[PDB]
Amino acid sequence: QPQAKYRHDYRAPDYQITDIDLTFDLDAQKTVVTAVSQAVRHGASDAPLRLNGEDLKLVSVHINDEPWTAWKEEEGALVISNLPERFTLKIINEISPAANTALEGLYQSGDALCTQCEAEGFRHITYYLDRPDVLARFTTKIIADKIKYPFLLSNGNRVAQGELENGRHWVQWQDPFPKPCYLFALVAGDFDVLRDTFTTRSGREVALELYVDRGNLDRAPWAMTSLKNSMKWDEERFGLEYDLDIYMIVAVDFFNMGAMENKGLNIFNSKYVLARTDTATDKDYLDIERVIGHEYFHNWTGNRVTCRDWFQLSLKEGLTVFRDQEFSSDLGSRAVNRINNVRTMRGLQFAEDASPMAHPIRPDMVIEMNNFYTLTVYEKGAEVIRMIHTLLGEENFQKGMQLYFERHDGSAATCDDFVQAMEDASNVDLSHFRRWYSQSGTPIVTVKDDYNPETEQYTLTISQRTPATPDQAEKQPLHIPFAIELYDNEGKVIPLQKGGHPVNSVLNVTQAEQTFVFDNVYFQPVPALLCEFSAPVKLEYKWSDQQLTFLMRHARNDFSRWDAAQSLLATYIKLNVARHQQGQPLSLPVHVADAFRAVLLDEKIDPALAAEILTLPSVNEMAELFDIIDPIAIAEVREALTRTLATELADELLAIYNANYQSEYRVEHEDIAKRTLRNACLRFLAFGETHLADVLVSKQFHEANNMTDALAALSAAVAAQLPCRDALMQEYDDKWHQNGLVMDKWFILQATSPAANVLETVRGLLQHRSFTMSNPNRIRSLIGAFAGSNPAAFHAEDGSGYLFLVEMLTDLNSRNPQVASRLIEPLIRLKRYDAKRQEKMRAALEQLKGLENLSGDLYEKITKALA
Ligand SMILES: CC(C)C[C@H](NC(=O)[C@@H](O)[C@H](N)Cc1ccccc1)C(=O)O
Ligand SMILES: [Zn+2]
Numbered sequence: 001q002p003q004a005k006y007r008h009d010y011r012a013p014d015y016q017i018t019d020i021d022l023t024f025d026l027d028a029q030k031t032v033v034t035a036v037s038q039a040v041r042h043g044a045s046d047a048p049l050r051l052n053g054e055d056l057k058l059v060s061v062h063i064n065d066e067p068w069t070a071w072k073e074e075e076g077a078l079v080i081s082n083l084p085e086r087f088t089l090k091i092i093n094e095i096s097p098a099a100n101t102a103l104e105g106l107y108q109s110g111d112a113l114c115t116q117c118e119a120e121g122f123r124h125i126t127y128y129l130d131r132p133d134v135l136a137r138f139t140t141k142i143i144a145d146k147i148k149y150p151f152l153l154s155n156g157n158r159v160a161q162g163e164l165e166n167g168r169h170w171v172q173w174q175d176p177f178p179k180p181c182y183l184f185a186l187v188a189g190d191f192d193v194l195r196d197t198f199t200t201r202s203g204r205e206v207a208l209e210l211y212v213d214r215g216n217l218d219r220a221p222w223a224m225t226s227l228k229n230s231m232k233w234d235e236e237r238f239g240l241e242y243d244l245d246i247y248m249i250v251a252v253d254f255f256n257m258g259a260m261e262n263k264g265l266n267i268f269n270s271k272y273v274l275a276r277t278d279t280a281t282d283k284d285y286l287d288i289e290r291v292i293g294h295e296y297f298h299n300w301t302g303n304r305v306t307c308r309d310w311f312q313l314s315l316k317e318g319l320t321v322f323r324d325q326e327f328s329s330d331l332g333s334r335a336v337n338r339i340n341n342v343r344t345m346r347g348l349q350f351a352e353d354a355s356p357m358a359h360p361i362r363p364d365m366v367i368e369m370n371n372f373y374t375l376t377v378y379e380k381g382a383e384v385i386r387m388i389h390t391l392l393g394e395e396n397f398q399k400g401m402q403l404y405f406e407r408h409d410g411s412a413a414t415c416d417d418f419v420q421a422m423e424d425a426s427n428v429d430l431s432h433f434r435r436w437y438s439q440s441g442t443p444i445v446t447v448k449d450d451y452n453p454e455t456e457q458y459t460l461t462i463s464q465r466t467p468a469t470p471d472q473a474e475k476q477p478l479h480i481p482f483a484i485e486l487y488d489n490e491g492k493v494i495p496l497q498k499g500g501h502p503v504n505s506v507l508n509v510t511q512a513e514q515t516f517v518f519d520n521v522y523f524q525p526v527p528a529l530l531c532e533f534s535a536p537v538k539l540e541y542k543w544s545d546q547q548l549t550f551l552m553r554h555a556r557n558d559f560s561r562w563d564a565a566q567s568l569l570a571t572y573i574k575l576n577v578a579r580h581q582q583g584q585p586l587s588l589p590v591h592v593a594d595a596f597r598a599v600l601l602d603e604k605i606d607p608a609l610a611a612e613i614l615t616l617p618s619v620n621e622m623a624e625l626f627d628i629i630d631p632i633a634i635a636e637v638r639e640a641l642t643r644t645l646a647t648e649l650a651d652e653l654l655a656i657y658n659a660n661y662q663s664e665y666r667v668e669h670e671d672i673a674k675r676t677l678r679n680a681c682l683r684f685l686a687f688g689e690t691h692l693a694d695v696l697v698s699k700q701f702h703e704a705n706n707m708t709d710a711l712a713a714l715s716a717a718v719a720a721q722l723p724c725r726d727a728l729m730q731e732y733d734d735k736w737h738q739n740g741l742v743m744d745k746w747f748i749l750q751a752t753s754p755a756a757n758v759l760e761t762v763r764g765l766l767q768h769r770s771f772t773m774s775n776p777n778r779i780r781s782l783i784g785a786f787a788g789s790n791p792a793a794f795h796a797e798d799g800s801g802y803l804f805l806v807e808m809l810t811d812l813n814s815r816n817p818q819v820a821s822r823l824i825e826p827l828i829r830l831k832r833y834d835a836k837r838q839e840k841m842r843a844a845l846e847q848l849k850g851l852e853n854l855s856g857d858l859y860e861k862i863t864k865a866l867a
Helices: 221-238 282-297 310-331 334-353 375-408 415-426 545-554 558-580 590-601 607-613 619-623 631-648 650-659 669-685 690-703 707-719 725-736 740-751 758-767 776-789 800-815 817-828 835-849 856-866
Strands: 015-025 031-041 049-052 057-063 071-074 077-080 086-095 105-109 112-116 137-145 151-154 157-163 168-174 186-189 192-199 205-212 246-252 265-269 305-307 411-413 444-452 457-465 480-487 506-509 513-518 526-529 538-540
Touching: 057 077, 112 246, 112 265, 137 151, 137 186, 151 168, 192 221, 205 221, 221 246, 221 282, 221 310, 265 282, 282 310, 282 669, 282 707, 305 310, 305 375, 310 334, 310 375, 310 415, 334 375, 334 558, 334 607, 334 619, 375 411, 375 415, 375 480, 457 480, 457 506, 480 545, 526 545, 545 558, 545 590, 558 590, 558 607, 558 631, 590 607, 590 631, 590 650, 607 669, 619 631, 619 776, 631 650, 631 669, 650 669, 669 690, 669 707, 690 707, 690 725, 707 725, 707 740, 725 740, 740 758, 740 776, 758 776, 758 800, 776 800, 776 817, 800 817, 800 835, 817 835, 817 856, 835 856
Parallel strands: 015 137, 205 246, 246 265, 305 411, 444 538
Antiparallel strands: 015 031, 031 086, 049 077, 057 086, 071 077, 105 112, 112 186, 137 168, 151 186, 157 168, 192 205, 444 457, 457 513, 480 506, 480 526
């Protein structure tokens, strides 16, 4: 297995390549690549040029057209010795796109040929300096059969084109912007193309082109609209304009991730492009908006300024995720977006930070870089950027962005460079703050308060600590922006002050323990703590149920109201899981049910907020409330809680469900909010009197005039195991079996079903007409959903879930390591479960560990999980 690489070993390259001219003689079985690079030595004169290469058939090596004899091929490299200070390197090699099942480098997607080069896929195309601090100007000539590949695309603009004998043709592209090879892209195939235009604020007219498989034009307008929305927003919010003449996006069916920001030629998983009202849900529309925007935002945060090395991945991913969240939030509901992102942080990222794979947002050790496009690097990375925004304020934050681009435009930078730019532009000291980049694990912030009537002072005693993680035995206090707000008994905000001077609501929690005193607090306050999730930490405060219901009705920020409800539910989710383990039924105080009844009947509350408060935490969110996870107890308690609320709020739920009916379907935020609330109510109504529920659900499925409402009904039928379930599921299959993206929703429902025979059903679906092990989307929607989204079934006491996953991973380890690595994650969490389960999970991991040709992707995770 390959050795681990460490951030502290970074060293500038001995050679730089300033320009590269590529020529591809394209063919699915045998592609011939000719690469002419202009190299310049920067290191010692006796240093050899070390080129990275994987699975390449070397044809020849020339230096200034002279056949070179001073070279040697070694594991993953071509080492060239005795070179001039400046020279022209010419490499000719062959590759086989059709044989590329890992989908890394140049591969085949259906009948099209396309690429994926990040993190290190370009080395699978030709021998090169496959490191992001080497920026070269690319020129790409593509030669191919005209009938099979009428469209030949690469980064930049077309500078040449011609016809050849034997029905072949070629096109040459030039991208003026120097770039690391991970941003290189090539696409060849036959597509339908949606063309539009966007005029920047300064007048630059940009040609927009969206390439989709023939017959998919009816699902392309929303993505195009989202691209234009993204371009406009970046101008308005960040003052950034697109910098090229054309913007191409190609939607492909076979892609390991969601999308890729290749300069001027983004390549997208079709899941994040294709949408029409009968195939896509409101969520799909908003996800397409998010991803289209995300990759577009990389044009500046990632492309114009790239990464010095891969340990600096968060420099572009954390910042770009922050940007896509601000984009979504500005255009839609900021409260809903913040709530959703906090659910991801608390329910998924915290779990990772408490797992064997824990790492700082800026990793120190990496074996397989593809294993580091994580919730930590992305989501926590964004939370760190957001904390900088919280500490600086929008104005100074933008000044920091401006200085960052001024200093690093056209180069590869580091996380430290970014922080320095923010510090220098704002004059805000971020020296202590920097620890957020080096320390893994989730900080735990404990708060104790006291109200002194004699002095009319409110005191907060705040403590912090980060438990040790398997990767770091030493932990230190962080600079935690801790936002608060105090309310009097009328729900009015109490001015924060001390010694006659106002105090900022964002407290600087920088020590292991500290006190914060506020005077002129005339009456005992109810505090709102860690407002808007001001820092990615776990809050420990002894809330009374009344303080929480008070906040649910009076908190100024909608997020606080949702957050208070989560704290209220946590107490009873924990209470009932303990009861479940002792064979006792659900117990819930009347005043708790009343709090949710109040939310339903509050006419002043935003439907968007009400919908989220009425959406119970997922089983994965619930799992984080426990030291030792009991997946079956959690799943059954979640259903029991749903049933109890459905019974206690039956009339109110139906009233709100009916009140939010909308005849017209619009992908507009106000409409989406009402529909989300209506369907939130439907989830509960599905657990009402069987016949009543069955009729209501089947009715919505059949009368729905959009996929959002149809899927909501189908999901409810499956969740409540209603009589109509089998009929509706078969009807969906018969109508959509030919559409993979649509069937993925169906596979997810089958995989996350509460039915006793779910595994048997999932295994059988491996033979379904709409499923195929060759497609990452299908794999993740069926197998991934089962293992990661149905922990109750995956963790069946008999161990059947683990055995099934081992079978699937034995296949995927050889076929597609990246997808295999995404799928093994559930097994890596073994220490969070009981002894019996740990034993079975360890056995499963040991079996995988002994696999012939074990991929580095899995090796890295298996090793840490078995430690
Ligand atoms: C909206 C985005 C956060 C979705 C996300 N895509 C990205 O982050 C891209 O900008 C990544 N740069 C693409 C990528 C992902 C994984 C490994 C190598 C390369 C993805 O999941 O593909
Ligand atoms: Zn990204």
